[PDB]
Enzyme design. Structure first.
Site, PDB file in Angstrom:
ATOM      1  N   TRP A  54       3.535   2.812   3.619  1.00 52.54           N
ATOM      2  CA  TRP A  54       3.150   3.707   2.509  1.00 52.54           C
ATOM      3  C   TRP A  54       3.683   3.064   1.221  1.00 52.54           C
ATOM      4  CZ3 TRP A  54       0.221   5.033   5.754  1.00 52.54           C
ATOM      5  CH2 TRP A  54       0.075   6.287   6.428  1.00 52.54           C
ATOM      6  N   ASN A 167      -4.209   6.857   1.871  1.00 57.23           N
ATOM      7  CA  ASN A 167      -4.183   7.130   3.311  1.00 57.23           C
ATOM      8  C   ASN A 167      -5.091   8.293   3.641  1.00 57.23           C
ATOM      9  OD1 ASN A 167      -3.249   7.055   6.086  1.00 57.23           O
ATOM     10  ND2 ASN A 167      -2.198   9.009   5.622  1.00 57.23           N
ATOM     11  N   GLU A 168      -6.125   8.005   4.448  1.00 55.14           N
ATOM     12  CA  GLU A 168      -7.059   9.009   4.959  1.00 55.14           C
ATOM     13  C   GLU A 168      -7.716   9.909   3.900  1.00 55.14           C
ATOM     14  OE1 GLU A 168      -5.155  10.911   8.438  1.00 55.14           O
ATOM     15  OE2 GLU A 168      -5.608   9.100   9.623  1.00 55.14           O
ATOM     16  N   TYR A 243      -8.215   9.119  16.746  1.00 55.69           N
ATOM     17  CA  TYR A 243      -7.358  10.177  17.317  1.00 55.69           C
ATOM     18  C   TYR A 243      -8.210  11.185  18.049  1.00 55.69           C
ATOM     19  CZ  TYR A 243      -3.616   8.317  14.336  1.00 55.69           C
ATOM     20  OH  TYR A 243      -2.594   7.593  13.787  1.00 55.69           O
ATOM     21  N   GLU A 276      -5.483   2.730  12.474  1.00 55.08           N
ATOM     22  CA  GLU A 276      -4.553   3.636  13.151  1.00 55.08           C
ATOM     23  C   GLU A 276      -5.191   4.109  14.464  1.00 55.08           C
ATOM     24  OE1 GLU A 276      -3.153   7.105  11.270  1.00 55.08           O
ATOM     25  OE2 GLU A 276      -2.972   6.245   9.277  1.00 55.08           O
ATOM     26  N   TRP A 306      -0.728   3.179  15.690  1.00 57.63           N
ATOM     27  CA  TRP A 306       0.147   4.108  15.000  1.00 57.63           C
ATOM     28  C   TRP A 306       1.062   4.633  16.105  1.00 57.63           C
ATOM     29  CZ3 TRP A 306       0.805   5.881  10.018  1.00 57.63           C
ATOM     30  CH2 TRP A 306       1.735   6.952   9.896  1.00 57.63           C
TER      31      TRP A 306
END
Ligand SMILES: *[C@@H]1O[C@H](CO)[C@@H](O[C@@H]2O[C@H](CO)[C@@H](O)[C@H](O)[C@H]2NC(C)=O)[C@H](O)[C@H]1NC(C)=O
Ligand code: NAG
Ligand code: CL
Length: 345
Positions: A54, A167-168, A243, A276, A306
């Site tokens: 990050w 991020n995302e 995910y 990820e 991840w």
């Protein structure tokens, strides 16, 4: 010099081929240099060449002393912490990466509220929900000044793999043009500052009309269109996350997800990064299959699980159930074996 793309593959330190890496969002917030070096040394001896971290840490008031913070948004202004408990912590990560021959993906803001995110900008600047961030001129001005400060700080370093927008990022129920326009504007701005560094989005890979099964991730409800955004000239490679347990799909569905993105990347003529992926149980069997698919898929040039774990001065690093710890059995399956497999391509 800087890492790059070569067709559908990546090039690092003059070597063109598939690469394995991982994620450590927390490394830039550690305060002990020995822990940063411990991690970098372990990544190097593991053959993991790309580390995603990050590059943000947004707050709306100064935190209690000792807590790392990168940017404060208060009284209608954004202030950047260049002190010892600020960007000097990211500096150590960049410097340690240079020393250990590790390349970093550094993103500039979180879509989620962890470490402030777009919501911290909205709290300070006004608006409702993360989506107002994208089209807010005051927030984009603050975000671009932060980007400029970070990018210029590391302008002489060869250890940055790519600058990543966020991020995302999502824009729930937004027309896909909202993120498309913001990605185009932001990536052009970054390229103006650092023309030779790769730039990527950091999204989950949603919105895909190639081999869709009609499930939620392939649809366009999160404001993302994978193929449309990957055509932006100032974006060098696509990103996808994976995910199944969070998206209500099966583990096997993950292989099709990788394959389909590979097809879109091939069509765009740009590599895809499986950026990820994780599950909280049955790590080896489930994720090992995804790794095999990523390696064999045309268009997928690297994968980062991840997330990385290690035993620091303060105890084990964060365990969100997805963590794979250096020196363990799952680590041998998902790192030692995978790196060996890639080298035996
Ligand atoms: C997502 O972006 C793709 C372009 O990358 C759009 O796909 C086009 O869709 C139209 C019909 O809507 C076709 O005629 C084109 O051939 C498609 N181009 C492709 C796939 O290369 C798609 O419509 C977009 N969907 C959104 C934003 O909802
Ligand atoms: C980069 O290097 C140049 C020349 O070596 C120097 O003038 C500049 O200040 C450096 N920028 C940094 C360290 O951010
Ligand atoms: Cl284990």
């Amino acid at each position: 010099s800087f890492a790059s793309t070569s067709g559908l593959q990546f090039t690092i330190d003059g070597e063109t081929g598939y690469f394995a890496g991982t994620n450590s969002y927390w490394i830039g917030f550690l305060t002990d240099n020995a822990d940063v070096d411990l991690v970098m040394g372990h990544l190097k001896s593991s053959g993991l060449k790309i580390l995603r971290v990050w590059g943000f840490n947004d707050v709306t008031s100064q935190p209690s002393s000792g807590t790392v913070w990168y940017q404060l948004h208060q009284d209608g202004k954004s202030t950047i912490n260049t002190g010892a408990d600020g960007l000097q912590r990211l500096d150590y990560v960049v410097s340690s990466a240079e020393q250990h021959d590790i390349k970093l993906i550094i993103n500039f803001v979180n879509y989620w509220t962890d470490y402030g995110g777009m919501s911290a900008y909205v709290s300070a600047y006004g608006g409702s929900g993360e989506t107002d961030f994208y089209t807010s001129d005051t927030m984009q001005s603050a975000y671009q000044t932060y980007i400029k400060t970070v990018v210029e700080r590391y302008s002489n370093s060869s250890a940055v793999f790519a600058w990543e927008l966020a991020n995302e990022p999502r824009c729930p129920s937004c027309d896909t043009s909202v993120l498309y326009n913001w990605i185009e504007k932001t990536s052009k701005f970054i390229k103006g500052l650092d023309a030779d560094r790769m730039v990527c989005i950091g999204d989950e890979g949603f919105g895909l009309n190639i081999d869709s099964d009609g499930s939620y991730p392939y649809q366009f409800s999160e404001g993302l269109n994978f193929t449309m955004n990957l055509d932006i000239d100032t974006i060098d490679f696509g990103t996808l996350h994976l995910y199944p347990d969070s998206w209500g799909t099966s583990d096997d569905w993950g292989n099709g997800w990788i394959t389909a993105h590979g097809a879109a990347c091939k069509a765009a003529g740009k590599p895809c990064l499986l950026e990820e992926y994780g599950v909280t149980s049955n790590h080896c069997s489930v994720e090992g299959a995804w790794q095999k698919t990523a390696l064999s898929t045309t268009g997928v040039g690297a994968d980062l699980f991840w997330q990385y774990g290690d035993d620091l001065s303060t105890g084990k690093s964060p365990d969100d159930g997805n963590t794979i710890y250096y020196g363990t059995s799952d680590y041998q399956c998902l790192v030692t074996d995978h790196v060996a497999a890639i080298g035996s391509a």
